[PDB]
Amino acid sequence: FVEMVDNLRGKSGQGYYVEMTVGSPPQTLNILVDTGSSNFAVGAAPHPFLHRYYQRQLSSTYRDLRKGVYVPYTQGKWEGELGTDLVSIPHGPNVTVRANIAAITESDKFFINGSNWEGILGLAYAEIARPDDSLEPFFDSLVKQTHVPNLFSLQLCGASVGGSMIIGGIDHSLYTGSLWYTPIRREWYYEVIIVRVEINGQDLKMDCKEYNYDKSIVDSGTTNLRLPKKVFEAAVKSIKAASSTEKFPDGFWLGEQLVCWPWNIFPVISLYLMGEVTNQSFRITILPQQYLRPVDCYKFAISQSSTGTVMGAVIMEGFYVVFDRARKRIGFAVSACHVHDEFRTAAVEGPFVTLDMEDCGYN
Ligand SMILES: NC1=N[C@@]2(CO1)c1cc(-c3cccnc3F)ccc1Oc1cnc(-c3ccnc(F)c3)cc12
């Protein structure tokens, strides 16, 4: 997998992208890597923000599905035209597959002014694909048409960012210690169940259903750790208390302003995840180095949500994350590239005894 190491690039706050090719002869595009959606969709028209776009007229292997797709999502929208073509990943496995591609022909607040990617690779499951679950996601096509094992793993390393997407396996050099696995509750988003939350080792003591109201997901396409309102409330309260050596405005905690300079006054955040065995859990712990984001000034990168918990880049940059689709589980291990100090490091630890973990899931 050496060839796949360092195959991700990005700019801070604009996501991680991987190089891909589409069509024959191959047209190179940079594509945003997104575990929180399920369509492969690429710019297909000369939008001013784009370095380049898919030109279907130049591809002998393009096939028109003669169907449109309309995709509003919470912070933007794209619309396009469905087709298939040959797709490969130059710094991925040595294969070429026929995949569904949505040629993006209209959009709003989707492309980022100044970014270096031209499309999105939705790595989640068919249940949330648009227009419906009959549009086979890219990764499903890749596994169906090749011998690539049904898993991928992400090391997001965090100004220009970098990382690794290991397609079809695990690179043990990218983590320390052991992987710990939590079940994929349902194959739609990469849905997981958080069974306990601590701030500096202090239990928030909420009914655990609240932690997963209405879901908890692992999402490379979200920057922040997003928490449901009631839990964000309780977590900010405890983090405020833990960091009371210095005072900050109410706006800072709501993302509305920055603060400038101090690590040790800020508490660690621990999420206990449902384990593989009955009544067994493990915990992942991140640092302020993960949830205080550079813009030395910083932004509070934990925010409230109405769509449930989102373990975005703030969580994922602490860990090597294994999307073990074959066994319906997600692995976490301490990342060999995460940012820390001489006093504290991100951790993955277990086993712990946790009862009633099935009650933590929302129905
Ligand atoms: N996980 C996630 N993916 C985003 C929103 O959150 C998305 C994120 C970004 C984005 C922006 C900044 C930094 N990182 C990113 F991934 C850009 C476009 C974008 O575009 C999207 C387009 N469609 C979806 C989508 C559509 C239908 N069902 C879904 F579940 C998700 C999601 C997204």
Q: How many domains does the chain have?
A: 2
94 lies in the same domain as 216: no
- Report angle CA 345, 297, 261 to the nearest 5 degrees: 80
Residues 161 and 138 occupy one common structural domain: no
CA of 278 to the centre of ligand 1 (A): 34
Q: Of 110, 132, 148, which one is at a domain's C-terminal end?
A: 148
C-alpha distance from residue 290 to each of 221, 293, 298 (Å):
16, 7, 11
Does 128 contact ligand 1 (Cβ within 6 A)?
A: yes
Q: Are residues 160 and 95 both part of a single domain?
A: no
| Single-letter amino acid code for the residue at 7 | N
Residues 202 and 281 both lie in one domain: yes
How far, CA to CA in Å, does 204 sit from each of 114, 131, 282, 353? 40, 40, 17, 17
Concatenated DSSP letters of 176-218:
EEEEEEEE--SBTTBEE-EEEEEETTEE----GGGGGSS-EEE
Sequence-distant (6+) residues with CB within 8 A of 159 are 11, 12, 294
SS3 311: strand
Q: Are strands 216-218 and 280-286 parallel, antiparallel or unpaired?
A: unpaired
Do 203 and 82 have their domain in common? no
Q: Is residue 122 part of a domain?
A: yes
Whether omega before 26 lies within 30 degrees of 0, making that bond cis, reads: no
Q: Which residues pair with 180 in a beta bridge?
A: 332
Q: 241 in helix, strand or coil?
A: helix
Is residue 168 a part of any domain in this protein?
A: yes
Same domain? For 256 and 284 the reply is yes
Q: For ligand 1, pick from 47, 186, 222 the residue to mutate: most ligand atoms within 8 Å of CB.
A: 222
- DSSP string of 315-352, one letter each residue: HHTTEEEEEEGGGTEEEEEEETT----SS---EEEEEE
Taking the centre of ligand 1 as the mean of its atom positions, its distance from the CA of residue 118, in whole angstroms, is 13
With beta carbons less than 8 A apart as the criterion, state whether 316 and 334 touch: no
Residue 197 included in any domain = yes
Give the number of other CB atoms < 10 A from CB of residue 264: 11
156, 16 Cβ separation under 8 angstroms: yes
Shared domain for 242 and 351, answered yes or no, is yes
Which residue among 148, 173, 194 closes a domain?
A: 148
Distance CA 52, CA 45 (A): 9
**Are both 166 and 229 inside the same structural domain?**
yes
Question: At 300, is the secondary structure helix, strand, or coil?
Answer: strand
DSSP state of 19: E
Shared domain for 125 and 186, answered yes or no, is no
CATH number at residue 88: 2.40.70.10
Amino acid 220 reads S
Range of the structural domain that residue 69 is part of: 16-148
CA distances from 88 to 20, 53, 221, 284 (A): 6, 16, 21, 34
DSSP string, 99-151: EEEEEEEEEES-S-TT-S--EEEE-S-GGG-SS-TTS--HHHHHHHHS---S-
| Residue 78: inside a domain | yes
Annotated catalytic residue 296: no
Quick check: 275 and 182 in contact, CB under 8 A?
Answer: yes
Q: Is residue 158 part of a domain?
A: yes
113 lies in a domain? Answer: yes
| E strands in 23-95 | 27-34, 40-43, 63-73, 76-88
Whether 159 and 299 map to the same domain: the answer is yes
**Domain end call among 148, 166, 198:** 148
Ligand 1 neighbourhood includes 34 CB (under 6 angstroms):
yes
Q: Which tokens belong to 295?
A: 């813009």
How far apart CA 94 and CA 3 sit, in angstroms, is: 10
CB-count exposure of residue 129 (10 Å: 0-12, 13-18, 19+): buried
Would residue 219 show up in a list of annotated catalytic residues for this protein? yes
Report how far residue 336's alpha carbon sits from residue 4's, in angstroms, rounded to the nearest whole number.
Answer: 16
- Same-domain check for residues 139 and 40: yes
For residue 10, tell me if it sits in a domain: no
- Contact, 37 vs 120, CB < 8 A? yes
Residues 128 and 220 in one domain: no
Q: Resolution of the experimental model in angstroms, please?
A: 1.8
Say if 269 falls within a structural domain. yes
Q: Which of 338, 214, 329, 199 has its CA nearest to residue 271?
A: 199
CA–CA distance, 118 with 60 (Å, rounded to integer): 21
- The strand pairing partners of 30, in sequence order, are 19
120 lines ligand 1 (CB under 6 A): yes
- Does residue 137 have its Cβ closer than 6 Å to ligand 1? no
